[PDB]
Design a binder for this molecule. Structure first.
Ligand SMILES: Cc1cc2nc3c(=O)[nH]c(=O)nc-3n(C[C@H](O)[C@H](O)[C@H](O)COP(=O)(O)O)c2cc1C
Ligand SMILES: Cc1cc2nc3c(=O)[nH]c(=O)nc-3n(C[C@H](O)[C@H](O)[C@H](O)COP(=O)(O)O)c2cc1C
Lengths: 347, 347
């Protein structure tokens, strides 16, 4: 596998936007033998570029950069904004402009990634034109794309991508569906089932993602056909992670015992720890991304500033309670040991 | 493991009520090295007893019998019944009596199982009094209980059960939650995540269940800590399965491409292929089991008689599209080969 040939361990640190996966995190993962990732989501092409340069100065090993696919333009937003008036007053801040960018600097970011190629680039919220995949391939970059169904995985393969990331329903953060609709509600596929379906639907390498917190689960996905395992929440809790303290603390807090997929914070289905904001607005959140995301961004910033986890987007997979707080490099070592231990057991 | 010591292969054929798992199915599984299961759900103690005798004449190998835990008594039922008036008229049959038994012959069935012990007994919809577990243990019967969360699994262990069945959200048929409430809606845990959580929550053997259709997935759960894999949908499609033809046909029918958890047919969350009945009544089905089950039973019988899959409870796990139609014994052989193939790959 061209992908797994880049790094020794079948472990990928999921790109996590919002200041979570900073250069220091990716570097520690890379240096430990895994594939570190930078998140270009919500950053400017320049911001992304600065982190790429930063990381190259931290490690000479392969790493990835994740980018969001532009989203097409859509009454519901107006109603939701109204329902958030109380939040705005409480956090003493104005709601953001719902119409503040849908491309997320896609064109400028691609220019950067093509002018100064990185080892791996992944895409979320859809599939790039096959010309984009081809140009990146020519530049020597491996391409990955998330799929949540075997149909989406076939689309990833048809686009010429090098590998597909099979993200199960257990995953933390945003579901990487190529298109969001009310129908996806309750249609999420468990990773073990999605992995098997995707493996039989395409011939390209598969990276399993969703709820993976232990080396034994990594062995599990490998046994089921995956070439590697991508972990977000497990790394969110590490020291190098730039996730806010209230967010890291919530992962193992009994008061945040459960997670749920919701459009409350961004207008697109994303798994977060259940908190006040989710309980109050989740049932009425409309499918309007990134409109809703822009709308609530100021609210979330204010909540974070105050250290109030009840008003934050506590992205977390279903395995959050198993999060371990230690250096990312040491977590890779523990995962590697658990993986080896599980391998031996299976024989 | 006392459980896996009973049969050579780490494969369990899930008990499936409604005439699906008949003696011939269990026998073929047992004879192939797996653990065949009889379903006592909805049958009288006598009906269950006749199948047990039948099976003993078909195989001398270990098998299991599954029983439903009695359910406590609960306006909503009246409203749902009203909404089903059209179904009653269309299928030209009366709705069943919502108050037609909540114990499901529990006491009489236990008397039978204790007077003429079987190798394995499993429980669904809760946990038996620890005295029941103790008496069965003394009689030489191994006890299994389904859990859908680590909390429920701890309850299973505390009751003294020999093993817990970790049933993930991908599972077909009824979710084995110990108590049903609107809160369980959207709280389902993916099997790979549930398995890891349960493995760290209890010390007793774990049987993984939900979406398992291939030997590689069996290797996957073993790698993650399970002692065996329990498969329902995979066996539902075999020749020995007594599932109605329209039900077996629906599993791979593109027109029934998706599944969803619903209370439409029985008043308790159960995963079925999306069909007309589910689309129409699912959104309004109340949490009232087995009240709703009794209510719709006549409707489902009529639909089945007519071969109309749109009015049937098409129980199926998320891996239904991978169903294979062949003798159950041959399916065990294929699964065994896939398991071995996956083991080798992991090393
Ligand atoms: C903190 C949070 C932020 C995330 N940000 C991104 C992102 O910017 N781009 C992306 O492709 N995936 C993102 N993900 C999803 C991950 O790629 C991965 O699918 C998920 O973390 C898998 O679940 P666990 O989180 O591993 O259960 C994010 C997940 C979380 C936890
Ligand atoms: C046809 C249908 C009927 C079922 N009946 C029972 C039952 O009577 N008792 C029980 O404990 N589980 C029952 N199950 C659930 C199974 O024990 C198991 O959890 C499920 O089949 C696992 O998913 P797949 O179906 O293996 O994805 C049933 C499942 C389906 C498919």
């Amino acid at each position: 596998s061209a992908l797994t040939d880049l790094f020794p361990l079948p472990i990928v640190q999921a790109p996590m936007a919002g200041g979570v996966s900073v250069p220091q995190l990716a570097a520690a993962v890379c240096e430990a033998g895994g594939l570190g990732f930078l998140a270009a989501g919500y950053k400017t092409a320049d911001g992304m570029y600065q982190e790429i340069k930063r990381l190259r100065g931290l490690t000479g090993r392969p790493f990835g950069v994740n980018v969001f696919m532009p989203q097409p333009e859509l009454g519901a937003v107006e109603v939701y904004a109204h329902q958030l008036a109380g939040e705005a007053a409480w956090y003493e801040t104005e709601l953001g402009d719902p119409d503040g960018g849908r491309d997320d600097g896609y064109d400028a970011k691609l220019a950067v990634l093509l002018d100064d190629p990185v080892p791996v680039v992944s895409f979320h919220f859809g599939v790039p034109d096959r010309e984009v995949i081809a140009r990146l391939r020519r530049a020597g970059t491996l391409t990955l794309v998330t799929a949540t169904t075997p149909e989406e995985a076939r689309a990833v393969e048809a686009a010429g991508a090098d590998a597909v990331i099979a993200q199960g329903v257990e995953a933390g953060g945003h579901q990487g569906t190529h298109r969001d609709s009310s129908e996806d509600d309750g249609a999420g596929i468990g990773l073990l089932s999605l992995l098997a379906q995707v493996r039989e639907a395409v011939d390209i390498p598969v990276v399993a993602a969703g709820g993976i917190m232990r080396g034994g689960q990594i062995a599990a996905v490998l046994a089921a056909g995956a070439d590697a395992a991508q972990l977000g929440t497990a790394f969110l809790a590490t020291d190098e992670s730039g996730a806010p303290g209230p967010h890291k603390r919530a992962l193992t807090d009994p008061l945040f015992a459960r997670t749920r997929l919701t459009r409350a914070f961004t207008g697109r289905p994303a798994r977060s720890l259940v908190n006040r904001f989710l309980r109050e607005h989740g049932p009425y959140a409309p499918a309007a991304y990134p409109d809703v995301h822009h709308l609530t961004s100021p609210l979330r910033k204010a909540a974070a500033k105050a250290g109030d986890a009840q008003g934050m987007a506590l992205w977390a997979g279903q395995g959050h309670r198993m999060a371990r707080e230690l250096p990312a490099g040491r977590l890779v070592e523990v995962l590697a040991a658990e993986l080896a231990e599980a391998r031996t057991a299976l024989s």
